[PDB]
Design a protein around this ligand. Structure first.
Ligand SMILES: [Ca+2]
Ligand SMILES: [Ca+2]
Ligand SMILES: [Ca+2]
Ligand SMILES: [Ca+2]
Length: 366
């Protein structure tokens, strides 16, 4: 059934750009959903898609995702995402990333790219050779801009906010948090949680990762399949997405979900289930926004203190989604979508009077 244009119509996508270069064998999709708030910011992601169609669907899905992520995050950015089709192991060249960066320069700052999955500051520095519409590449972001602890602080602050609602106190003192995954971002969330005096049950597909964790925080290890059934107050999915589904959600003994993974929900039903089951689902794209807020900050000359003080406010953003769920009698995830759509609409109206020059987040556009 799937028709590029019927999807763009139904979902209201602005632009989808297909890019090819001969010598680099570049096949790239830049997807731009909504730019009401400003330039579309979204990671470049490289992957071995089975078909053109697989890649388009992923590009579109992830682009609309950034529209909500960025809008809710209070950022003056739209929803975009780019995607290269190929083997990240074998097909990265200079020409690949230069050619792509040229096609990013072609859109004259409607798309701003950054590192995502299977792409690195090294790749972005090739893009940077052709365009200034790339972020996470400056000396300031290079020196003291190491992103993991900032995403983590976002998630930490958002969890605090959720706890205030259900428990009546934002203290995570003597709370048990089930933590799926102990990657960089998770490891740093564990640190804030241990320092507040919280009990940590964890899992990971990696053994060295697990032992580093139990060594440093004294966390009880548990089997990948057990983590959902475990007896804890808060579940924190920080590994993969679609971890909240038909199979896992009935197991949950927790009162809050508050993790770092993108697209925790496998389907929207799973949002409404967590609802019926009386579990407060603190939505992905609100809580883990810290990552995008960090690169967005570079656009204005990077300052980690300012980034952290802006991410500190993920608490206030979560608390607003809760308020909106109660007030509009909606499930958390649909309240977060509303909050983002309310803001887009509001600023589309509040800035609809003529100025010879409107100020946007591109300082010196290049
Ligand atoms: Ca060419
Ligand atoms: Ca070719
Ligand atoms: Ca979404
Ligand atoms: Ca992220």
């Amino acid at each position: 059934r799937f028709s590029i244009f019927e999807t763009m119509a139904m979902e209201d996508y602005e632009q989808v750009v297909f890019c090819h270069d001969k010598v680099s064998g570049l096949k790239a999709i830049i997807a731009i959903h909504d730019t009401t708030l400003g330039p579309a910011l979204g990671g470049l992601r490289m992957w071995n898609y089975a078909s053109d169609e697989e890649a388009l669907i992923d590009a579109l899905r992830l682009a609309k995702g950034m529209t909500y992520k960025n809008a809710a995050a209070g950022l003056n950015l739209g929803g975009g995402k780019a995607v290269i089709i190929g083997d990240a192991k074998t097909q990265k060249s200079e020409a690949l990333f230069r050619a792509f960066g040229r096609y990013v320069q072609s859109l004259n700052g409607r798309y701003i790219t950054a590192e995502d999955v299977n792409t690195t500051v090294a790749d972005m520095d090739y893009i940077h050779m052709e365009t200034d519409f790339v972020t996470g590449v400056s000396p300031a972001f290079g020196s003291s801009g190491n992103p993991s602890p900032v995403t983590a602080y976002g998630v930490y602050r958002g969890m605090k906010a959720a706890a205030k609602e259900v428990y009546g106190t934002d203290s995570l003192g003597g709370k048990t948090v089930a933590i799926q995954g102990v990657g960089n971002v998770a490891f740093n969330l564990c640190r804030h949680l241990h320092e507040e005096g919280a009990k940590l049950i964890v899992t990971d597909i990696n053994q060295d990762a697990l032992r580093r964790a139990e060594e440093a925080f004294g966390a009880l290890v548990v089997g990948p399949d057990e983590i959902y059934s475990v007896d804890a107050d808060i579940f924190a999915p920080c590994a993969l997405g679609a971890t909240l589904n038909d199979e896992t959600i009935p197991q949950l003994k927790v009162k809050i979900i508050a993790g770092a993974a993108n697209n925790q929900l496998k389907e929207d039903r799973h949002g409404d289930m967590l609802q019926e089951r009386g579990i407060l689902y603190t939505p992905d794209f609100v809580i883990n926004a810290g990552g995008v807020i960090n690169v967005a900050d570079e656009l204005d000359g990077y300052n980690r203190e300012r980034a952290m003080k802006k991410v500190e406010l993920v608490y206030d953003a979560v608390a607003k989604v809760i308020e909106i769920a109660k007030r509009d009698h909606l499930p958390t995830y649909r309240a977060a979508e509303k909050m983002a759509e309310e803001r887009i609409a509001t600023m589309g109206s509040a800035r609809s009077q003529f100025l010879r020059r409107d100020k946007n987040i591109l300082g010196s556009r290049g």
